[PDB]
Amino acid sequence: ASLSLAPVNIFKAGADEERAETARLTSFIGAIAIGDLVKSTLGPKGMDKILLSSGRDASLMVTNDGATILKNIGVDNPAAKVLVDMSRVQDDEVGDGTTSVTVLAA
């Protein structure tokens, strides 16, 4: 059968379990969303993004740096979180390639 689509639900109120096709669906759409977000900043004619934070300070940033853009976004997709952490690690290792790695993974 299946964990969720079973006659009895085996989970606490609020949990969930995306199976084979639904899992790859969420994963691919999230990663590709992250990638399509961070591209268009790629290359000499790349354009910047605005990081209009909604906090009580409403910090404002204008960046073409993929690492900063991905750090400063509220992600809820786990695959997108993976790509975000990957760009952060790229920024730590070297100082360039965070958008190239993000776009490549996507």
Binding site: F11, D76, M86, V89, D92, E93
Partner: protein
């Protein structure tokens, strides 16, 4: 169906027996067993897709949204937010397999789920669940003895590490770190061989420090026959490399002494003040002079120190580390051959450790520094430094290497090895079928069911590898019966041969025996339950 006792007295007077009987639930009899079996079947069918080299991973998200990608059944069922008590029993089962063995955490769950799935049909046919549990116990005894029978032995010496690298590679075949398969297996082997009383005695994993740092490549993961610390030298102008380092390990902060008892030193005159002043000066100088006179070229404190001590260390050419943790202090002592000193007066040239290299290591554009201590003579401690492109693969590599270390440990405890690829399960299923042909008719259905359940691991391996379960399993079973060869299993990697003894697919005999024993015992405790009474309140 539920709601415990419902009568409300024949006379018409209130009938209240249990507290919140109206809010409480209860399931009795065969329907309770069927609910248990469905829950276990769901858990097992979730896990069976993470089984074998071609097994896939699961991405767990915690309460605060952190992601963990893993193939480890124990880690999955621990990260899994279950509310069904039978699912909790299966989580406990997998955790138990991890505690005792450190591998098999996914096989146990699949096998227990299969045993209960077969008990479902046996109960449908009308057999008492206890008779099912007893037939399963009997068949489990048969399979355990048959494992002892078909088992093989491997050499656990440090001169021929190939059987151990093969075992560790089999363990790490199913994990994401098989991209550096042998590189990972080798170091797991060397780790357990470095830290072990190899007289078939224990392996203390506290002597293996598994450290991870984002950055680098998986290929950079390595074994340091020594220690790594997340600290740097105390002063920024000290040297970043020390060769032939004589180490003084200290748990005394380089600060003026202070009694533990409530004390009040009274200053009553300018002379008392000047005496205090020079006392402080002379204490700092005397500490540094005591550290120098022992001959040390490096100091390692546990409790941090102050500006005067730091500058005196620099001035006297004494590189020094501060704020090292108790466990790291212990590991440095064990590795360098040094003794931990609580005060400077007790410091001597013999209590010092020796490290052939103490280095400060950078990590690119980070500002983060680490301290490596290595090239010790006979370090009984070791570190596995893991690198990678994201924290997910680093943590998965950590747990995968833990599996490999536990496997090498189990080899050091018992050198006997059974051959995997589902071959051991097929052979045990054959043995149980044979012994069932001899028992009285009624415990024969339960032994045949145990055999059909043992056959779920080969089916799962074939299925995850795209093969047809029934076809492949029947063919390899027929071959096993004809040519006596309990090394015939599922070619998950499609190397052509079905002979796992040739493919170097190796499991530990204690591992398989523990899988079988744990699955059978927990299936017994589950079939023995026929009533449930949850709070059922749906509270907050």
């Amino acid at each position: 169906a539920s709601m415990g006792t419902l009568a409300f007295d024949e006379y018409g007077r209130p009938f209240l027996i249990i507290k919140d009987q109206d809010r409480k639930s209860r399931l009795m009899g065969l329907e309770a067993l069927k609910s248990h079996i469905m829950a276990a079947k769901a858990v097992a069918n979730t896990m069976r897709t993470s089984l074998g080299p071609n097994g896939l991973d699961k991405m767990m998200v915690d309460k605060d949204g952190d992601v963990t990608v893993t193939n480890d059944g124990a880690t999955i069922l621990s990260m899994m937010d279950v509310d069904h008590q039978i699912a909790k029993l299966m989580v406990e089962l997998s955790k138990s397999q991890d505690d005792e063995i450190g591998d098999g955490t996914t096989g146990v769950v699949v096998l227990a789920g299969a045993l209960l799935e077969e008990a479902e049909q046996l109960l449908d046919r009308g057999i008492h669940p206890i008779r099912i549990a007893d037939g399963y116990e009997q068949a489990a005894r048969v399979a355990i003895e048959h494992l002892d029978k078909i088992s093989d032995s491997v050499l656990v010496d440090i001169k021929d590490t190939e059987p151990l690298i093969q075992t560790a590679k089999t363990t790490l075949g199913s994990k994401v770190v098989n991209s550096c398969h042998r590189q990972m297996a080798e170091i797991a082997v060397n780790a357990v061989l470095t830290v072990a009383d190899m007289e078939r005695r224990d392996v203390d994993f506290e002597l293996i420090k598994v450290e991870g740092k984002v950055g680098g490549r998986l290929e950079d993961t390595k074994l340091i026959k020594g220690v790594i610390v997340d600290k740097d030298f105390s002063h920024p102008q000290m040297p970043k490399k020390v060769e032939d380092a004589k180490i003084a390990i200290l748990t005394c902060p380089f600060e003026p002494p202070k009694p533990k008892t409530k004390h009040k030193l009274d200053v009553t005159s300018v002379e008392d003040y000047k005496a205090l002043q020079k006392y402080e000066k002379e204490k700092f100088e005397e500490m540094i002079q005591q550290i120098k006179e022992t001959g040390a070229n490096l100091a390692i404190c546990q409790w941090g120190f102050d500006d005067e001590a730091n500058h005196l260390l620099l001035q006297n050419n004494l590189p020094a580390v501060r704020w090292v943790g108790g466990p790291e202090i212990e590991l440095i002592a064990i590795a360098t051959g040094g003794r931990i000193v609580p005060r400077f007066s007790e410091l001597t040239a013999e209590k010092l450790g020796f490290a052939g290299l103490v280095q400060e290591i950078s990590f690119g554009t980070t500002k983060d520094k680490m301290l490596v201590i290595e090239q010790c003579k006979n370090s009984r401690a070791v570190t596995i430094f893991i690198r990678g492109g994201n924290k997910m693969i680093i943590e998965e590599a950590k747990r995968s290497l833990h599996d490999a270390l536990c496997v090498i440990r189990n080899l050091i405890r018992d050198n006997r090895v059974v051959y995997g690829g589902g071959a051991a399960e097929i052979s045990c299923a054959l043995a149980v079928s044979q012994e069932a042909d001899k028992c009285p008719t009624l415990e024969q259905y339960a032994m045949r069911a145990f055999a059909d359940a043992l056959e779920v691991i080969p089916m799962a391996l074939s299925e995850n590898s795209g093969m047809n379960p029934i076809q492949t399993m029947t063919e390899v079973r027929a071959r096993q019966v004809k040519e006596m060869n309990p090394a015939l299993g599922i070619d998950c990697l499609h190397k052509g041969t079905n002979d796992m003894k040739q493919q170097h697919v190796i499991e530990t005999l204690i591992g398989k025996k523990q899988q079988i024993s744990l699955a059978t015992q927990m299936v017994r405790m589950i079939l023995k339950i026929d009533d449930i009474r949850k709070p059922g309140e749906s509270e907050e």
